[PDB]
Tab-separated table of C-alpha atoms and ligand atoms in Angstrom:
chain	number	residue	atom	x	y	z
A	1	UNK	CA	-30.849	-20.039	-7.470
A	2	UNK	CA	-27.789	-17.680	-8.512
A	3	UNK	CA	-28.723	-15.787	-5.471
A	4	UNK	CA	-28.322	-17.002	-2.146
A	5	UNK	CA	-30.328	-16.822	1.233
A	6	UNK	CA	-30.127	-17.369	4.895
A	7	UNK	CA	-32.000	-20.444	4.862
A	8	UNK	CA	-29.732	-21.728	2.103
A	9	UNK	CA	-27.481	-22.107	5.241
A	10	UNK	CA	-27.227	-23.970	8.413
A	11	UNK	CA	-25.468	-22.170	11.167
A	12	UNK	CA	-23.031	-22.956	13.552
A	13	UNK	CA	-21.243	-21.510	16.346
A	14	UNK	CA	-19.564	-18.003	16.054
A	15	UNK	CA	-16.058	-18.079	14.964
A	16	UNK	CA	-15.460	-14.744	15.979
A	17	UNK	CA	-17.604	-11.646	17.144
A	18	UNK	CA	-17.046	-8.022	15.680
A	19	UNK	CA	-18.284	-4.947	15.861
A	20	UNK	CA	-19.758	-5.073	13.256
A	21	UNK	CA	-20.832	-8.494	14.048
A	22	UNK	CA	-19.960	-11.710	13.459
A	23	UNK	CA	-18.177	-14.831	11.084
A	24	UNK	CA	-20.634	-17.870	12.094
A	25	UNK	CA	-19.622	-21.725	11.292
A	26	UNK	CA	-22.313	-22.937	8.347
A	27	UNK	CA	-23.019	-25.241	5.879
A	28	UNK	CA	-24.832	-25.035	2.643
A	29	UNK	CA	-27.684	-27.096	2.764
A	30	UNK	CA	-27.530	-29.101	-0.027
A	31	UNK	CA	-23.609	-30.655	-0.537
A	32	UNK	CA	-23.203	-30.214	2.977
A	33	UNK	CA	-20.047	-27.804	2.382
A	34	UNK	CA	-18.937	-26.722	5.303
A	35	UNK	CA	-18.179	-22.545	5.215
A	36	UNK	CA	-17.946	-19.259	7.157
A	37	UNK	CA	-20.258	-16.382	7.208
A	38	UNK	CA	-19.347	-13.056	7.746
A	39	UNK	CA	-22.010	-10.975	8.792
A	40	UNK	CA	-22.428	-7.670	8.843
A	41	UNK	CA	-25.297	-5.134	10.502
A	42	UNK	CA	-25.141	-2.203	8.372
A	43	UNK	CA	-26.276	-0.586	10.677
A	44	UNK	CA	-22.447	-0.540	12.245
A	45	UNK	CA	-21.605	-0.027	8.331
A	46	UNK	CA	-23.859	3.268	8.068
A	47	UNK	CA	-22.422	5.258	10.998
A	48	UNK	CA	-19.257	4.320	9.827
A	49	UNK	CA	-19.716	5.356	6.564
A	50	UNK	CA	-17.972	2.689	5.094
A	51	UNK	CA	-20.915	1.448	2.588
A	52	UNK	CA	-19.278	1.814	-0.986
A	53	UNK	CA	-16.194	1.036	0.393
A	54	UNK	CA	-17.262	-2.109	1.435
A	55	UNK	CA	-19.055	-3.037	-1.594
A	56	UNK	CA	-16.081	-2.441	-4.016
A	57	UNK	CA	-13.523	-3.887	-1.290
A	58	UNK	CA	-16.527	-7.514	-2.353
A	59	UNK	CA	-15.539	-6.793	-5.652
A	60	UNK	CA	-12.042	-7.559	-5.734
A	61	UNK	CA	-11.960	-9.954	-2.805
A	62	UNK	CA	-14.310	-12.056	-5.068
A	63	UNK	CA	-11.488	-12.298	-8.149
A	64	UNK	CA	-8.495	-12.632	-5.810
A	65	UNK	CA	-7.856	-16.313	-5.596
A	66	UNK	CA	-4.606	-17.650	-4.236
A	67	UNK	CA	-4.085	-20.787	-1.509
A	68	UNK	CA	-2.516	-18.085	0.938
A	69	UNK	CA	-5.726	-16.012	0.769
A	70	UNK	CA	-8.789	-17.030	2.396
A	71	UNK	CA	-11.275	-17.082	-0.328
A	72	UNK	CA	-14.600	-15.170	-0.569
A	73	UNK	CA	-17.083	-17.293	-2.086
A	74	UNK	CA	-20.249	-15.690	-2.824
A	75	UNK	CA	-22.620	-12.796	-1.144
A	76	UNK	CA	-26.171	-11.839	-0.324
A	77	UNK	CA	-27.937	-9.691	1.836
A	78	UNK	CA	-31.052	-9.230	2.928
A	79	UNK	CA	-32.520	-6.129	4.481
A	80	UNK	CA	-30.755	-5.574	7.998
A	81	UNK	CA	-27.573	-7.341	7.090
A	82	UNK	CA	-24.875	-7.935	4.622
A	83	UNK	CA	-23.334	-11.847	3.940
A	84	UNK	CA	-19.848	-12.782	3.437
A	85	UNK	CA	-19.622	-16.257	2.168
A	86	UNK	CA	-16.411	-17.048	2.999
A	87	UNK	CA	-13.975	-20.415	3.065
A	88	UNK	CA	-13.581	-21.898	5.936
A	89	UNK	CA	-10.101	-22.309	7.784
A	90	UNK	CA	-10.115	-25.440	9.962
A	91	UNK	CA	-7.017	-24.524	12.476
A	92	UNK	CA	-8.246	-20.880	13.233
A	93	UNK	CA	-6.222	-18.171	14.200
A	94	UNK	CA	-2.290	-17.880	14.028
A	95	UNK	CA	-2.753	-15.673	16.812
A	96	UNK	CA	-4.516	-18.455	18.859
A	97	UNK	CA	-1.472	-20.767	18.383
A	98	UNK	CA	0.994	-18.356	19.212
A	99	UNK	CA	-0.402	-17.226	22.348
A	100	UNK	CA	-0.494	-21.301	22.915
A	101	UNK	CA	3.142	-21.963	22.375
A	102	UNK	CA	4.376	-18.109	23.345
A	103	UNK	CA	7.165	-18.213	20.216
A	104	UNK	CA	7.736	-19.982	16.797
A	105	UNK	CA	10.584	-21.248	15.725
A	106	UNK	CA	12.440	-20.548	12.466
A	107	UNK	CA	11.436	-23.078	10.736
A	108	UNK	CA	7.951	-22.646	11.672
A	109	UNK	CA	8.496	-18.488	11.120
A	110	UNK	CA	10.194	-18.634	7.616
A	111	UNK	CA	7.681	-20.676	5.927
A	112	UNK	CA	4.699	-18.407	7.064
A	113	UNK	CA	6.892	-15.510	5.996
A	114	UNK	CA	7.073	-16.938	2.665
A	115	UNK	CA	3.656	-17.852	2.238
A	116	UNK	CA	2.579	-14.240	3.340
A	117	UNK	CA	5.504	-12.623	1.127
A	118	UNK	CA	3.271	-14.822	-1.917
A	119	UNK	CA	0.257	-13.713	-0.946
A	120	UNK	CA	0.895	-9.924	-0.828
A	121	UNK	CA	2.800	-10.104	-4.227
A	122	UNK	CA	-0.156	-12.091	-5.633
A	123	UNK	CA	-2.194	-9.030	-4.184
A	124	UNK	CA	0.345	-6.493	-5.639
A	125	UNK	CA	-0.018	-7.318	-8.512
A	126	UNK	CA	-3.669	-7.107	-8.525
A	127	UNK	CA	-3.113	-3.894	-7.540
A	128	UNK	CA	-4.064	-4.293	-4.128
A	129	UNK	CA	-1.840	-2.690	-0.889
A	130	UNK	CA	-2.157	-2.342	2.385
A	131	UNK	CA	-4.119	-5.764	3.746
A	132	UNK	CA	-3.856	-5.938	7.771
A	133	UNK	CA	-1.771	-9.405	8.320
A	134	UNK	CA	-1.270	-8.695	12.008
A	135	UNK	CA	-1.603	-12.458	13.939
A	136	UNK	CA	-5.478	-12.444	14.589
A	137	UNK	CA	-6.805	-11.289	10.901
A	138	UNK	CA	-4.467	-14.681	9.967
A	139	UNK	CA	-6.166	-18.219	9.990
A	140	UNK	CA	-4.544	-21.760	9.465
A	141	UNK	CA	-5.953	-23.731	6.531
A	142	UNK	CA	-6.510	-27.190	5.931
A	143	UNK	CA	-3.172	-28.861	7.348
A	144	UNK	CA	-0.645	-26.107	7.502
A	145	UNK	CA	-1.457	-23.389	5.431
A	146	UNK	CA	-1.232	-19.410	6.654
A	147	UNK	CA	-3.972	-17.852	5.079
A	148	UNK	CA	-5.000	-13.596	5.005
A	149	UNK	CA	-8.641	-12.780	6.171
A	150	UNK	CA	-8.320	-8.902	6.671
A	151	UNK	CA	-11.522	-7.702	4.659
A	152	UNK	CA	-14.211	-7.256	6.883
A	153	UNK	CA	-13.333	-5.965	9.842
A	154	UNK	CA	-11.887	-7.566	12.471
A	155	UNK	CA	-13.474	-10.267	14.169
A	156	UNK	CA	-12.252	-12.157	17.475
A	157	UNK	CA	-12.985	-15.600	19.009
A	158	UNK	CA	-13.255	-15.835	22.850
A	159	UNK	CA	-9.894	-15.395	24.569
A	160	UNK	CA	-7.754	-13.223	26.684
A	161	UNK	CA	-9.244	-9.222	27.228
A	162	UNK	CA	-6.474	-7.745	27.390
A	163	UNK	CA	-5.983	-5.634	24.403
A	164	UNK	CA	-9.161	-5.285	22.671
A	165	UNK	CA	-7.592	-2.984	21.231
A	166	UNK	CA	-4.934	-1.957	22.926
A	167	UNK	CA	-3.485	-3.988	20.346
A	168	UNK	CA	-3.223	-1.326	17.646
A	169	UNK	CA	-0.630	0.689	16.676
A	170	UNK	CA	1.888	-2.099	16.690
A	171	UNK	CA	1.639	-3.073	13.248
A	172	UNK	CA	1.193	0.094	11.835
A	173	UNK	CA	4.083	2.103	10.051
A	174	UNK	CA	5.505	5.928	10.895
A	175	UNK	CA	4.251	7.086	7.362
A	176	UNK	CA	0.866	5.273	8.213
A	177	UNK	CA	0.516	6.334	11.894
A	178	UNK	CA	1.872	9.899	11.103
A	179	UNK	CA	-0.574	10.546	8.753
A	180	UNK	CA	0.786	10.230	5.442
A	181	UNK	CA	0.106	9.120	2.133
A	182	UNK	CA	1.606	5.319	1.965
A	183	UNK	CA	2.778	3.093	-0.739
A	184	UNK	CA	3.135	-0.484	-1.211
A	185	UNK	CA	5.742	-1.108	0.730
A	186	UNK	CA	3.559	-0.394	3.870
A	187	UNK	CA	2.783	-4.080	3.802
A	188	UNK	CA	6.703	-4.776	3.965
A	189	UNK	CA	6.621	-2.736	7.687
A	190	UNK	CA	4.181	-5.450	9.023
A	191	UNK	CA	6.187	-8.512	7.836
A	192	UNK	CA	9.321	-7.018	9.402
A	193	UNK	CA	6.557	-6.667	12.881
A	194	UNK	CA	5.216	-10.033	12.188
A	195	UNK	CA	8.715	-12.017	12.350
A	196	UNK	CA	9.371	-10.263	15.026
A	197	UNK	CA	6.467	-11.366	16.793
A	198	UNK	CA	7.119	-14.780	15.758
A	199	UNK	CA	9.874	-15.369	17.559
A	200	UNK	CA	9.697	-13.226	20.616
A	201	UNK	CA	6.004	-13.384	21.104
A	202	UNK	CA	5.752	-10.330	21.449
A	203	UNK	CA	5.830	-7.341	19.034
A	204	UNK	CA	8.708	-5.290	18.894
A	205	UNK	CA	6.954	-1.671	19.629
A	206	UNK	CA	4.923	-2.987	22.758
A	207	UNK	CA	4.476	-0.643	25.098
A	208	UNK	CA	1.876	0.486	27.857
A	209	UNK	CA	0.782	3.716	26.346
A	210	UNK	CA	-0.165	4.584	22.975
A	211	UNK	CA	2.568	7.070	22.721
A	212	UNK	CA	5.393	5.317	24.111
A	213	UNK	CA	4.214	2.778	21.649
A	214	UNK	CA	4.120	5.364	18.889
A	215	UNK	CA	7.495	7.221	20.349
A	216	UNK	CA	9.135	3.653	19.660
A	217	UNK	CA	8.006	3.043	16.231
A	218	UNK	CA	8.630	6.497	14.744
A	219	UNK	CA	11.814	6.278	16.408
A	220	UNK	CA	12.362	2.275	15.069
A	221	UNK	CA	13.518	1.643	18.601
A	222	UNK	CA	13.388	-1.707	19.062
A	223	UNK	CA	15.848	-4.689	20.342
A	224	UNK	CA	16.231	-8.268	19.872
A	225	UNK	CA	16.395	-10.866	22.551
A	226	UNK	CA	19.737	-12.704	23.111
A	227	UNK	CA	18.322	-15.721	21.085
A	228	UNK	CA	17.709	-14.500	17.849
A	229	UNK	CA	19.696	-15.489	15.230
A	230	UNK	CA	21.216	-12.659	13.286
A	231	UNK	CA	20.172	-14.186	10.072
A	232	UNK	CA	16.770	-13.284	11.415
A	233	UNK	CA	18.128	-9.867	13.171
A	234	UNK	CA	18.975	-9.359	9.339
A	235	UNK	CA	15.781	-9.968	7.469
A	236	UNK	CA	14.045	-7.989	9.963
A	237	UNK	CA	16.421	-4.724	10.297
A	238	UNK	CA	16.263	-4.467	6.682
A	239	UNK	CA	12.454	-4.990	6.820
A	240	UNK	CA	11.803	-2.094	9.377
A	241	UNK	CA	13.459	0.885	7.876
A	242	UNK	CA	11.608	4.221	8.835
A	243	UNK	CA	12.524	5.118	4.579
A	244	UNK	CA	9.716	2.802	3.110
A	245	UNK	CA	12.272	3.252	-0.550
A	246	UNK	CA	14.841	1.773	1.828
A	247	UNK	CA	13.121	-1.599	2.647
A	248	UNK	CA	13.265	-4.633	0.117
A	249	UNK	CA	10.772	-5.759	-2.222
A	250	UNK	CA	9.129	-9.096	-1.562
A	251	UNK	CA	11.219	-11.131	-4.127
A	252	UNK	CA	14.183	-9.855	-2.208
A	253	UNK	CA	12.828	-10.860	0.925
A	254	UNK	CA	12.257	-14.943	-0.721
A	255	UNK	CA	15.500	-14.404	-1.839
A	256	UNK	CA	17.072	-13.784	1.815
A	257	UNK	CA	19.362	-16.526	3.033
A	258	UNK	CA	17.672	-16.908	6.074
A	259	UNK	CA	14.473	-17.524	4.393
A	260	UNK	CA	15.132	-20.023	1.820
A	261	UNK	CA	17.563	-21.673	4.961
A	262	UNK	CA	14.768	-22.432	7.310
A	263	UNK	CA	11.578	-22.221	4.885
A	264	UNK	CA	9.859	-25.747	3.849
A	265	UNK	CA	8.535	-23.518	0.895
B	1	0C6	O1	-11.937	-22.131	16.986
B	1	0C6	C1	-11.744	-20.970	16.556
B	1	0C6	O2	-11.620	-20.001	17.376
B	1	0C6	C2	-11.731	-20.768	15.056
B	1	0C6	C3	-11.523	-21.878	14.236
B	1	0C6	C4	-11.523	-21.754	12.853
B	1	0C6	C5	-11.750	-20.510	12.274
B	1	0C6	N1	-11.740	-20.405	10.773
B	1	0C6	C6	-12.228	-19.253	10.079
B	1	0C6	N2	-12.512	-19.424	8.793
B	1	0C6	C7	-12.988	-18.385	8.065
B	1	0C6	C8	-13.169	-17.136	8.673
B	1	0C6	F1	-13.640	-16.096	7.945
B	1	0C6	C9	-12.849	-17.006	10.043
B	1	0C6	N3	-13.020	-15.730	10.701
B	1	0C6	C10	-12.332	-15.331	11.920
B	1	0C6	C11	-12.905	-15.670	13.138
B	1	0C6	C12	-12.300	-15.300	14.327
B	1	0C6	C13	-11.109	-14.583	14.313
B	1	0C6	C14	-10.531	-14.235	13.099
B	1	0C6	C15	-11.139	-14.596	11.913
B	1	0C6	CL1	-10.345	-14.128	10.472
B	1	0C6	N4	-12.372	-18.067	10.713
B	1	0C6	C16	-11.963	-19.393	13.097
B	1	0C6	C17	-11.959	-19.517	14.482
């Protein structure tokens, strides 16, 4: 019909619950596709303000297409609510799996790298910056695949409690927490905080208060574990820099011997 409804869908579980609601398992009637649907009250989008926002941010999301991306396929909406129709990702969140084996290894670590490294470039050069990768907005595609969600806002399936969030300032760089204006190479802080993660587990600006958290990153205080190789001490050193001009550009970082050394891709 060129427009779709609700009841062109049948609904699953929830994937994940927001706050400004939830990504539901579904399948389109018809062919039987199996997808996910974002949904999203509006009414949680009014207070927030974020209206226009959202409904350019559906714009480009739509054109972007790339295998490390999760794609957006279509959307409706239909008085109370708006509909993401989104692809599905079969092995959920990276976040889930690291919590279930505590670490990667490098192996495992470099080739995600990579794949996020293509992703953002693909996004750079549509013009697009700043997309949140931290472990939970990631999903796991069809076999192996580390795909982006970001876009609507966070969502989370039923785990730990934690953080909710808690969880927050640890992927987010001095010029970004501090309040300044932010380029592309933002998005080259968070890979530098996801490897870390990756191989500790942990991130590398965990604290118990916001402030020591926020002391730590301004400050780039952080230390490795005994274990990590340097190769990887490398990559990431020159990935957090507190001088975004002084941190690589993504080709540099496929480039990096420790990358294309451990990296299936
Ligand atoms: O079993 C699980 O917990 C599970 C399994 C597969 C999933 N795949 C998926 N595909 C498309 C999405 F937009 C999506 N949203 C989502 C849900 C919860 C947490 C994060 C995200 Cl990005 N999630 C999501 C969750």
């Amino acid at each position: 019909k060129r427009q779709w409804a609700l009841e062109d869908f049948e609904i699953g579980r929830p994937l994940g619950k927001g706050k400004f609601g939830n990504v539901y398992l579904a399948r389109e009637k018809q062919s039987k596709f199996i997808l996910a649907l974002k949904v999203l009250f509006k009414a949680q989008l009014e207070k927030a303000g974020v209206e226009h926002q959202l409904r350019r941010e559906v714009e480009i999301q739509s054109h972007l297409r790339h295998p490390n991306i999760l794609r957006l396929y279509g959307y409706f909406h239909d008085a109370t609510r708006v509909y993401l129709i989104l692809e599905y990702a079969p092995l959920g969140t990276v976040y889930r799996e690291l919590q279930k084996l505590s670490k990667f290894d490098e192996q495992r670590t470099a080739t995600y790298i990579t794949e996020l490294a293509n992703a953002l470039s693909y996004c750079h050069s549509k013009r697009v910056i700043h997309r949140d990768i931290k472990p939970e907005n990631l999903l796991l595609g069809s076999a192996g695949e580390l795909k982006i969600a970001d876009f609507g806002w966070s969502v989370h399936a039923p785990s730990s409690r934690r953080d909710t969030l808690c969880g927050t300032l640890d992927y987010l760089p001095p010029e970004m927490i501090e309040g300044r204006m932010h380029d592309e190479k933002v998005d080259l802080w968070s890979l530098g905080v996801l490897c870390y993660e990756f191989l500790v587990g942990k991130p590398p600006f965990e604290a118990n208060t916001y402030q020591e958290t926020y002391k730590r990153i301004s400050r780039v205080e952080f230390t490795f574990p005994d274990f990590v190789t340097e190769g990887a001490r490398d990559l990431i050193s020159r990935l957090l820099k507190h001088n975004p001009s002084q941190r690589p550009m993504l080709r540099e970082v496929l480039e990096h011997p420790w990358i294309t050394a451990n990296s299936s891709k």
